[PDB]
Ligand SMILES: [Mn+2]
């Protein structure tokens with residue numbers, strides 16, 4: 001069974017960028033529900049119930065048709081949010097090989113940011129914006145609802161290894177920014193954990 | 206060009222069920238944006254610009270590829286919300302031919318409510334729940350994002366004439382109910398405008 005992972009910091013650790021109230025609800029309510037629903041579906045699937053969540057979402061096709069969707073949505077939700085919590089932190093700075101790779105594939109850090117913001121703002125409805133690594137090259141893509149590029153193009157419409165991502169479901173920014181998703185996206189640059197992003201870039205898996 | 210319709214009641218006319226703050230933001234910000242983007246996309250196409258919004262969304266395949274998605278999302282958003290505002294009102298009661306048709310196709314009003322609640326609660330991500338008239342029978346269906354059953358099954362995955370609908374995008378209930386969409390859905394029964402619903406059922410078009 002999966003369990004709600006504890007945050008790598010306190011609920012108010014991202015103030016004044018991300019509000020304390022949302023962090024709490026987003027974690028203890030939204031993420032908790034994904035964990036609970038994923039467990040309920042896995043009770044009758046012992047073979048898959050033991051796989052790490054990041055691995056299970058790469059094998060959605062091997063699941064019985066009546067379970068494919070519920071797990072895509074909930075296991076996907078669990079995987080995405082787990083990665084999201086670890087990708088947030090104040091006080092880090094973009095540098096090293098990651099910074100070099102970004103300037104190489106996007107021209108500059110500013111071009112990259114503009115590209116990411118555009119993808120995040122243009123995702124209509126619920127979804128995520130990602131910075132992924134594919135073919136030794138970095139790219140910006142977005143997915144719908146709780147889909148992840150780890151699921152493959154056939155399923156999510158995107159592919160690649162997630163380096164970092166931004167949750168653009170309205171629950172992630174409505175209490176503080178309401179309809180102003182653009183302001184939320186800009187505030188994100190202040191809390192993106194570049195150390196974790198660099199770490200994932202180094203691992204490549 | 207489309208004009209943002211004014212509400213048929215005060216922004217707090219639905220209290221204590223739907224909060225005043227949300228009604229205002231939902232109307233003046235979210236709906237306003239859909240109208241703005243729909244009008245901008247129609248600036249160059251005079252043919253379709255003259256058509257009522259309800260008609261335009263039934264002819265999406267007759268639009269140039271580059272204009273199809275932007276209008277599907279925004280003209281759809283304009284049509285859905287316009288219908289939504291008119292479908293809300295306190296103090297009405299289900300009765301007459303509509304009440305009869307509901308008991309006929311669902312067994313009872315309670316079965317209908319349960320079916321509607323299920324569709325509204327199970328719509329993952331952003332979307333709408335609808336009570337549609339498919340020929341001579343009533344049915345409950347849901348669509349994603351700003352799709353409308355008026356767009357046809359090929360596009361929205363559903364079809365039929367909308368009698369009434371519920372917006373389940375998180376912005377419609379997050380300020381007051383946060384993650385508790387089920388409480389929001391229950392509260393909806395107190396503000397559904399049955400008179401307007403009955404009127405639409407009578408017109409059938
Ligand atoms: Mn989320």
Ligand SMILES: [Mn+2]
Pocket residue numbers: 231235286372374376377
């Ligand atoms: Mn809405």
